[model samples]
Target: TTLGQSAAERGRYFGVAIAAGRMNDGTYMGIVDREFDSIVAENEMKMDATEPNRNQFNFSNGDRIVNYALGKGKKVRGHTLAWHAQQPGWMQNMSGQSLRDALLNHVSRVASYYRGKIHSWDVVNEAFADDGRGSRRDSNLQRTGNDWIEAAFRAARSADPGAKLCYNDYNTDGVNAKSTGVYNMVRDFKARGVPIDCVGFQSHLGTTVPSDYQANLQRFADLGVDVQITELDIQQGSNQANAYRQVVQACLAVSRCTGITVWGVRDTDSWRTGANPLLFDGSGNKKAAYAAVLEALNA
Candidate 1:
């Protein structure tokens, strides 16, 4: 199959976000069968990272996804290796020096495991508070303070010297206070010689919610590293026909934005399952948002 009508017909800017199960099961192959340039494995990579054993790393899931991408000659984005959420219980329970050491070990192992195989990693994910200050209480990485971000990056850097490490998060779209905070934090890290290579602006947006979407992304690019429209999906209820189309156009307006991944290919498979935020309707028909993405990319 050629790149689908959306990509081939419209002409450019097309990619898909996939779960491990989908990729391993050949569902990803089906998407690729339609012609997406890249595939971001959503959670399998992270699940591998958090596996609760020292010598027992589980590659069964992610390996298949990566292999599928490789088989198709497609680019692969590592969804994540370290995040406050979706971590193993043991890592979450520790504190102080031991916790830090465990965190580093996990990062090193996971990053090294996928070193040359994947292109980029959401190395340190959702590590910051919305305010950009250290998380106040014991939430994910906050249990270790804002320092967890640095630690995770350091570990990933050590493990995968070649792969680009990214700080990924939601609500960082369109220059809001939260985005500014995240931007400043990344800048500070860079000045301090931290090994960050990219910023993933998770554009999990709603239609008409935040204006200046493109402008905000440009600001992130101004920070000196490549920025991507990671994990993009517009919730159905919020975007009317024209609004959804405009959002896609907004993503295409930026050139530094290397990739745009919808959270799910079809609405039925969405994590927010019943929500209409995906590219296809329940019956797998392309929605206006999906068509708009193809339009924006191809334009």
Candidate 2:
């Protein structure tokens, strides 16, 4: 939250992200330990369309996530019901109507299974490239063009009528071919009457701020939808610490920018492996971006 230790420790930010199955027994202990208001159920709950429905309803992984969040009175964010990777084996071979059925069935099952429990859901994930054009055709989603994206959203919306649904993707930091494509798609979806409610701008940036990150969010807001800075982190290198702080300010500046989540809790635990894009270093010290984010939020 603020420029300090964990969000739980700092008591400023509202949520924390946890890879559902990464920990051992009583993994939710960490979340409870942090006393977070919300938890973003990370991967493993729904690896892909098939994994969740590979043979039957395997709530072992996902249940723990939901139970934990509810137990602690914390809101849950469904990581994804549809994504390109970690999918079940059957999904790869299915085609035509079969594939569409599998996709819809999977969405309805998972979305309905936890319908009233989750606060929000990432109905679809990273289906488009940064350029905005459809990604590779071989990718599970591109195999059906944008049809699956639409279907997934509709199914989830039907299942969880009360939850906020989001189209989560990365590299929308600045307006680019990719972001433009997403903008257009969202606009088209709106015109055609879709159930989408929010756009998850995964602002994973490197040095040198991407153009129009804030503007894109404003535009989305103008469309009468909420915008969240989901999965936010800036890789360190060219944009000195001061510049990174500015980027944080820009994201928080948007009234529609509901909230921001640094991808990792600590720099050492960051997915970057060897890079440092987040605010806390391995030692838990607040980086300039950390202070800047808190300052911007207060402003």
Q: Pick the candidate with the highest lDDT.
A: 1
Candidate 1 C-alpha lDDT tens digits along 133-246: 433224645566667788788888888888888988887777766777778888988889998888987777665546787788787777777777677676676454455566
lDDT against true structure, model 1: 0.69
Give the CA lDDT, 0 to 100, for residue 94 in model 1.
Answer: 64
Error (Å) of candidate 2 at residue 208 is 3.6
Q: What is the C-alpha lDDT of each candidate?
A: 0.69, 0.68
Clashing pairs in 1: 4-34, 12-298
Candidate 1 residue runs with Cα over 4 Å from true position: 1-13, 23-29, 47-50, 131-140, 237-244
Tens digits of lDDT, candidate 2, 83-161: 7776777677777667777877887888888879987788888877643364432465567655778988999999989
**Deviation from truth (RMSD, Å), model 2:** 3.9
CA RMSD of each candidate after superposition: 3.2, 3.9
Best by TM-score: 1
